[PDB]
Amino acid sequence: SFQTQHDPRTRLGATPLPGGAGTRFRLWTSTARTVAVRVNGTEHVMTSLGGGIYELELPVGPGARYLFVLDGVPTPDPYARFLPDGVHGEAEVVDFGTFDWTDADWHGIKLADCVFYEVHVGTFTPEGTYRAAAEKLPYLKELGVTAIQVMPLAAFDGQRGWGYDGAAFYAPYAPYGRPEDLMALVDAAHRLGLGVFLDVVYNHFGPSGNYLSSYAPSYFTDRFSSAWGMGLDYAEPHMRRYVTGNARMWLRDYHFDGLRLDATPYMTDDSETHILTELAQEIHELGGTHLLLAEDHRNLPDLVTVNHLDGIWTDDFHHETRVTLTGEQEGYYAGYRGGAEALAYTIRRGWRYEGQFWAVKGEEHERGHPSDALEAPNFVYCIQNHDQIGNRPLGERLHQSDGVTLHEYRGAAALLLTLPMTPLLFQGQEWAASTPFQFFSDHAGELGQAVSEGRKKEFGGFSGFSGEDVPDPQAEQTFLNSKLNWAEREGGEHARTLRLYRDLLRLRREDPVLHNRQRENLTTGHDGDVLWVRTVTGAGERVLLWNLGQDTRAVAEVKLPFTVPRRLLLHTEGREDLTLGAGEAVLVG
Ligand SMILES: OC[C@H]1O[C@H](O[C@H]2[C@H](O)[C@@H](O)[C@H](O)O[C@@H]2CO)[C@H](O)[C@@H](O)[C@@H]1O
Ligand SMILES: OC[C@H]1O[C@H](O[C@H]2[C@H](O)[C@@H](O)[C@H](O)O[C@@H]2CO)[C@H](O)[C@@H](O)[C@@H]1O
Ligand SMILES: OC[C@H]1O[C@H](O[C@H]2[C@H](O)[C@@H](O)[C@H](O)O[C@@H]2CO)[C@H](O)[C@@H](O)[C@@H]1O
Numbered sequence: 001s002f003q004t005q006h007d008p009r010t011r012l013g014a015t016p017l018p019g020g021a022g023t024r025f026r027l028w029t030s031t032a033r034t035v036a037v038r039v040n041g042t043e044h045v046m047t048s049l050g051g052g053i054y055e056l057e058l059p060v061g062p063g064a065r066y067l068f069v070l071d072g073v074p075t076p077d078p079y080a081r082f083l084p085d086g087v088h089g090e091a092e093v094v095d096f097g098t099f100d101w102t103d104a105d106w107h108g109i110k111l112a113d114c115v116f117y118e119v120h121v122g123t124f125t126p127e128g129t130y131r132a133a134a135e136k137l138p139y140l141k142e143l144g145v146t147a148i149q150v151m152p153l154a155a156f157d158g159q160r161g162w163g164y165d166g167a168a169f170y171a172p173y174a175p176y177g178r179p180e181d182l183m184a185l186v187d188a189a190h191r192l193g194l195g196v197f198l199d200v201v202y203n204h205f206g207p208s209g210n211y212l213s214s215y216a217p218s219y220f221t222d223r224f225s226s227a228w229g230m231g232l233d234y235a236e237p238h239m240r241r242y243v244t245g246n247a248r249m250w251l252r253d254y255h256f257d258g259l260r261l262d263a264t265p266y267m268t269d270d271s272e273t274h275i276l277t278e279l280a281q282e283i284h285e286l287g288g289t290h291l292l293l294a295e296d297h298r299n300l301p302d303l304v305t306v307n308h309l310d311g312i313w314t315d316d317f318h319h320e321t322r323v324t325l326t327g328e329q330e331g332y333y334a335g336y337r338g339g340a341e342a343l344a345y346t347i348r349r350g351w352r353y354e355g356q357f358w359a360v361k362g363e364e365h366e367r368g369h370p371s372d373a374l375e376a377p378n379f380v381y382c383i384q385n386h387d388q389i390g391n392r393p394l395g396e397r398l399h400q401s402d403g404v405t406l407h408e409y410r411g412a413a414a415l416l417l418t419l420p421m422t423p424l425l426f427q428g429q430e431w432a433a434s435t436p437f438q439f440f441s442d443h444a445g446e447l448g449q450a451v452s453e454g455r456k457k458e459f460g461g462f463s464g465f466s467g468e469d470v471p472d473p474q475a476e477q478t479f480l481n482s483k484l485n486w487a488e489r490e491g492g493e494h495a496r497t498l499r500l501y502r503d504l505l506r507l508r509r510e511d512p513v514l515h516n517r518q519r520e521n522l523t524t525g526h527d528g529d530v531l532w533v534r535t536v537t538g539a540g541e542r543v544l545l546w547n548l549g550q551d552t553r554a555v556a557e558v559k560l561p562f563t564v565p566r567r568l569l570l571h572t573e574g575r576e577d578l579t580l581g582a583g584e585a586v587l588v589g
């Protein structure tokens with residue numbers, strides 16, 4: 001009985017009309033006294049309908065260029081579907097019905113079948129475009145990942161950026177390609193049987209290019225704010241519909257298979273029906289198999305059980321793993337001991353913090369909720385992602401941090417990719433890429449000059465930010481140094497690491513016991529610095545043993561509360577015998 005709040009007839013922005021009649025322009029403004037649309041340079045007064053809604057139909061088609069004129073001030077359309085000259089320019093009218101899709105028989109992907117691969121379009125290839133990314137899809141299919149996780153595409157200011165400064169949520173960022181280039185990427189992924197997910201940012205707008213307040217200040221509220229901008233007022237239905245209409249566009253019009261909702265703790269809403277619940281209703285109304293995930297640090301099961309999201313990016317696993325390997329304790333890493341026993345516990349519980357005191361300085365509070373309701377696929381785990389690389393002072397990858405060996409890096413991959421939780425990999429992780437992933441931006445004027453100090457303040461708990469070698473986010477070189485080097489994977493230890501990732505992803509796909517997706521069938525423990533993870537189903541038994549010590553441990557001498565299986569299925573260093581050098585792992589069955 002849920003009825004969508006969206007009807008193409010009343011869609012805000014510029015929408016092509018049936019029968020070649022042109023385009024319908026609509027906006028909401030609470031404050032303007034004169035309202036016009038300027039199309040291809042010509043101004044036309046719009047009709048007032050009441051409730052601050054204005055409309056006009058004109059015989060212009062796709063490709064027409066426009067903005068709105070509010071009390072004589074030319075103002076970009078917040079509902080723009082494309083901004084070819086950037087966030088301060090004219091929008092282009094887009095028709096979503098002309099692209100020739102070939103994915104009519106694609107039926108999406110289930111979360112339990114997802115192995116995510118996080119892509120930043122600008123750095124993923126030299127060209128930094130959708131078209132170039134599409135040419136790497138056969139490589140990703142063969143690698144064995146099943147869903148691409150694309151970092152945000154909403155238009156932001158400047159010529160490069162991560163995406164979290166997006167300001168025009170409906171307009172794919174022009175430097176990456178035109179709307180049809182994005183559609184071609186998704187179509188190509190679906191032809192290869194790969195899902196495609198999009199990172200969307202519904203907790204804040206970026207600091208340049210957000211003109212919503214020019215139309216109605218009440219899109220926003222001073223009731224609360226995030227670390228990155230003013231509060232989006234989800235008590236205002238037009239604000240709710242801004243993001244639910246956006247979600248529906250990506251899924252329906254661009255054929256994405258799911259969305260990853262950035263920083264859901266800062267989507268503050270005290271409405272009877274929470275905006276997250278309504279987002280789920282609105283995307284489900286499309287009548288497909290589209291998924292919603294939350295990036296949420298609160299360890300709150302209700303995101304799944306009440307808001308009806310499909311899963312949660314949960315960092316406790318990542319953090320416990322990193323601290324295990326480095327011993328680092330700055331910032332949020334002070335929340336974790338690390339080690340085999342600690343990792344066994346965090347896996348057993350899904351997340352570590354279920355209501356106990358988080359004792360980190362300046363942050364002391366009771367964190368989290370019981371994880372019991374959540375099943376394995378509801379937890380998205382990783383050992384690398386954009387934040388856990390890029391928010392480090394020098395943007396170094398896990399194998400690049402002091403004290404981490406490539407053997408430890410390879411062992412960590414085996415843990416991640418054999419667990420029944422839903423894994424994510426960051427681009428280049430699979431070949432132990434040599435390049436960092438640094439924070440880069442390209443803002444104009446004083447805003448641009450402020451980025452570096454904003455970073456140092458936001459991450460001031462990390463002493464490396466007060467050093468002298470922090471890469472300037474605004475420098476071209478910082479962007480270029482984050483580009484993947486595709487050549488390097490063909491040789492040496494990059495190739496060795498890649499072979500292991502291929503072998504792990506094959507086993508995950510093929511092994512009848514690792515097909516398990518039930519926490520009931522998963523147990524963990526430790527003996528000294530050796531972690532064990534056991535899966536038992538009707539199909540048999542598997543055990544992963546990871547030696548997190550700096551000595552050698554024979555599997556036969558690991559004390560276990562069950563009889564260890566005898567058959568060696570995969571060793572991370574390709575050894576014949578059941579013995580674990582420092583940092584090494586083995587899967588037995
Ligand atoms: O377009 C502004 C209105 O959006 C919603 O109205 C929906 C209605 O919920 C739905 O059943 C019908 O099919 O379409 C209309 C949109 O044309 C909100 O419910 C209204 O309050 C808004 O004004
Ligand atoms: O071209 C006009 C100027 O608009 C900008 O100001 C915007 C800003 O982009 C937006 O995010 C903020 O919240 O609203 C203001 C004013 O509407 C800047 O002044 C310049 O970059 C542009 O030249
Ligand atoms: O956006 C992903 C795909 O959405 C639709 O596919 C839906 C379909 O409409 C529904 O009947 C079905 O079986 O669920 C699928 C998957 O969500 C489009 O038809 C596909 O072309 C899109 O790729």
Ligand SMILES: OC[C@H]1O[C@H](O[C@H]2[C@H](O)[C@@H](O)[C@H](O)O[C@@H]2CO)[C@H](O)[C@@H](O)[C@@H]1O
Nearest residue numbers: 324327337338339340528529548549550
């Ligand atoms: O992997 C070696 C040991 O690492 C940790 O020990 C840490 C300890 O947690 C920390 O408070 C202290 O300041 O440093 C030591 C490392 O020197 C694990 O807790 C141990 O169980 C491991 O064996």
Ligand SMILES: OC[C@H]1O[C@H](O[C@H]2[C@H](O)[C@@H](O)[C@H](O)O[C@@H]2CO)[C@H](O)[C@@H](O)[C@@H]1O
Nearest residue numbers: 297315332335358360362363364367387
């Ligand atoms: O409640 C504990 C702290 O949670 C958040 O910190 C997160 C951070 O947002 C995330 O990017 C990082 O990977 O993990 C930490 C630890 O969970 C809040 O930002 C902190 O203020 C809280 O104290």
Ligand SMILES: OC[C@H]1O[C@H](O[C@H]2[C@H](O)[C@@H](O)[C@H](O)O[C@@H]2CO)[C@H](O)[C@@H](O)[C@@H]1O
Nearest residue numbers: 164165207228391439451453454455458
């Ligand atoms: O200039 C805008 C803000 O840029 C950075 O914020 C980044 C943050 O560092 C990154 O981890 C995040 O998730 O993307 C945001 C938004 O781009 C600075 O750290 C902030 O101080 C600036 O306001």
Ligand SMILES: OC[C@H]1O[C@H](O[C@H]2[C@H](O)[C@@H](O)[C@H](O)O[C@@H]2CO)[C@H](O)[C@@H](O)[C@@H]1O
Nearest residue numbers: 112511512513515516517518537538539
């Ligand atoms: O589809 C063949 C596999 O079916 C079962 O695997 C289940 C698994 O037991 C369950 O936890 C998970 O939620 O679903 C998978 C099926 O998708 C058998 O246990 C496997 O041995 C089979 O290979």
Ligand SMILES: [Mg+2]
Nearest residue numbers: 262263295387
């Ligand atoms: Mg984040």
Ligand SMILES: [Mg+2]
Nearest residue numbers: 527528529559
């Ligand atoms: Mg012992």
